[PDB]
Structure formats: C-alpha cells, structure tokens
Amino acid sequence: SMADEATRRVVSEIPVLKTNAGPRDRELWVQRLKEEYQSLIRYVENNKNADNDWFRLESNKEGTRWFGKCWYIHDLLKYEFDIEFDIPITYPTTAPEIAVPELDGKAAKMYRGGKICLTDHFKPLWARNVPKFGLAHLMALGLGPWLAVEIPDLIQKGVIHHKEK
Length: 165
What we know:
The chain is of the alpha+beta class. It has 4 helices and 3 strands, in the order H-H-E-E-E-H-H. Helices cover 39% and strands 15% of the residues. Strand 1 (55-59) and strand 2 (65-74) form a beta hairpin.
C-alpha cells in the first residue's frame, strides 16, 4: 500500500505505454517507440515545469541504443554525467540496464563496466507494471533515486569534484 502510493505519486502524470514489442518486432516496435517518445517528451516537459529538467536522451535510428546526459544538483552546484543503455531483445518485460560510464570503479552501487546497481525493489516494481512502464519510468524510478543516494555519497567522500565553468 505505501509502495503503490509512492509509485503513483512519482509517475501518475507520465503517459502510460501499451505495446508489447521489442527491437526485433518490426511495425509493432515502431509503434512501441511512438509510445516511448511521447511518454519521454511529456516527462521532460513536466520536469521543466517543476524546475527539475534533469536529463536529455537520444537514440539511434532503430531506437535500440540510447545515450545522453543527466544533471544532479547538490548544494546548488550542478554535476553532469553521460548515460547510455541498450534495449534488451525481451523489452519491455525486461528492463534496460543504465550505465553511467564515467563512474565505473567509483560509485558504490555499480557493476564493473558502469551499469548502476539498483535496489531489489525496482525490478519487481517494473515487473508488476509490464508493459505500462517505459524509458521515462526507468529514468524516474530507477536512475533518479540511484543518483539521489550515490552522487551525495561520492561528493562527501571526495571521489568526484565539480569542475569550474
């Protein structure tokens, strides 16, 4: 009951997705990508309205490789990190694995190679919502909360530093 409400508070203004298609699924994958792009751009617009415009993403032509940037504010300073992920063949039932490559070997909750290690509650949360969640939800429920623990830890520990601009 607390988990269901917390999830709704975060995602209730993100458009819900519908199509069960992954990268190999041809016209159904093009349809899934329309849903993904429309959910993502609404999430970006909502974030701008809330003074929390915290990421940009692009894909390759086929929509199977995603990359961009996120920004995290701590003590009013803005920290930028490059992000990337591949769409699993079994998407959207399987969730993508976000990587923050510059933090490889630095962040505590991270696999060798730069994939973030999310708490055990994200996977079953994604699983319980299939196929309604997409990349906007991956950002809002997966990377966002990861940054809000790991980036303050790394700044406190002196592992990362703000470069003058």
